[PDB]
Symmetry: C3
Subunit: 173 residues, 3 copies
């Protein structure tokens, strides 16, 4: 297993989330679809790597937990390195695990599960991929010691500003 | 290979299915989207395990077969144990095989194919997962001898009523 | 690794693509969903094999490239042989790689990645699957030398007309 952590940040400049509201209910419900795309940073928050991109399908409102259950299908993009794809549950009120459905580029052959931790609803999430199947060790610029997750984390200023020192080559946008 | 069978039943209490109509047709057509979530029971029908959850994308109506072709992306949830994710053909008129795209929890590393068997449209289905890649033998409460599929199968009364003897721990709902 | 090349062609007879417009702009944007299904032919263009089927989720317009980024979830159907499922990036303006999430039939256990090459937007594409995990060698009628990719490719007359010599057994439709 190679652990890979990343931070997903919604900086609200990608038209995301887009809510397609169709459910029988005022609250989120089955029928509601949420296409989305957020920014993706390294686990040590030093570099912008790319984006998340995909679809959240509402399954139910969970009133006891004051939150929603989604079924999510999406990918994580790492510039020229490639991408990872996942499928599984996103619960707005607690951590979950998703399936790693595959990958491309350096992530070809990827399998396993990924831990999803929401830090600030809906703007900050922290992921830990427990990656199996890779052909090589991950590049060092992706495996810096992760910043421990908390509501107070922020990407490095130079990564948010897209300085060359704060981005990977041809980071996904 | 570890065979795992489950029954999927729409008990009409989860607002499912939800039809998002966009095809210019009285019948299902390309454009129509169907988010869904049904109940999942063990193959021996003794216990409630969880739910299915995901999306059926209508591909075409097939008049000569009196049914529809869907393309389906969804997951099968087994309470505290984890989940399985699938992708592939969902035909209302005949049995099919779908791809196992991955899993989480005890299903981490899962791969192979799953047989979707028609039972009673649009209420009951029977599945057999041909599971490869699991870390351990499946728990016994999930691998009781399956009830042979027929139109008149029913979950055990304790399972339907969600009594502790009829559910797995933290059964998904 | 086993390489498998196929041509995907929109012959305008499957109601595809269907544009579900939800972004407020005239251009494609997040919120727009595109269910689709095209015809699939062998790499040597001698035989109809089946169809593609699934969903393109618009992620963003890319004005500097005069094109779109989609996130795609779909399958490739090969008649009685089975199917392959994929997840990943679909860019209207340049080639990409998608993840192979799994398969069924002769493609049970499939993993790897697939190169998507656009030939004519929005009508013709060429794919090269880098397939791992297959139980057997691919059937010879799928592994003929490909026609050189260009905007001018056409299926053999017998394949377009669905004569026995121009189709595989129970080709998907
Ligand atoms: C276990 C099978 C249960 C239901 C089948 C549906 C589903 O979960 C996914 C696709 C199917 C769509 C059937 C639509 C026909 C009926 C629509 C109206 C209704 O049943 O309330
Ligand atoms: C084999 C490729 C055939 C069609 C490509 C489409 C598809 O099957 C899935 C996504 C694509 C969407 C195309 C939207 C085109 C709308 C613009 C029409 C134009 O190019 O003038």
């Amino acid at each position: 297993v190679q652990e890979l952590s990343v931070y997903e940040i919604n900086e609200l400049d990608r038209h995301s989330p887009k809510i397609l509201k169709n459910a029988f209910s005022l609250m989120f419900g089955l029928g509601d679809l949420v296409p989305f795309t957020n920014k993706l940073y390294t686990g040590d928050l030093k570099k912008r790597v790319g984006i998340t991109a995909g679809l959240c399908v509402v399954i139910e409102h969970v009133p006891e937990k004051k939150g929603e259950r989604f079924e999510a299908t999406y990918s994580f993009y790492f510039g020229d390195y490639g991408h990872l794809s996942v499928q599984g549950p996103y619960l707005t009120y607690e951590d979950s695990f998703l399936a790693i459905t595959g990958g491309a580029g350096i992530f070809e052959g990827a399998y396993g599960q990924v831990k999803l931790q929401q830090l600030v609803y809906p703007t900050k999430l922290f992921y830990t991929f427990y990656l199996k199947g890779l052909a090589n060790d991950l590049p060092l610029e992706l495996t810096g010691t992760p910043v421990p997750p908390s509501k107070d984390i922020e990407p490095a200023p130079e990564a948010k500003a897209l300085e060359p020192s704060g981005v990977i080559s041809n980071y996904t946008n």
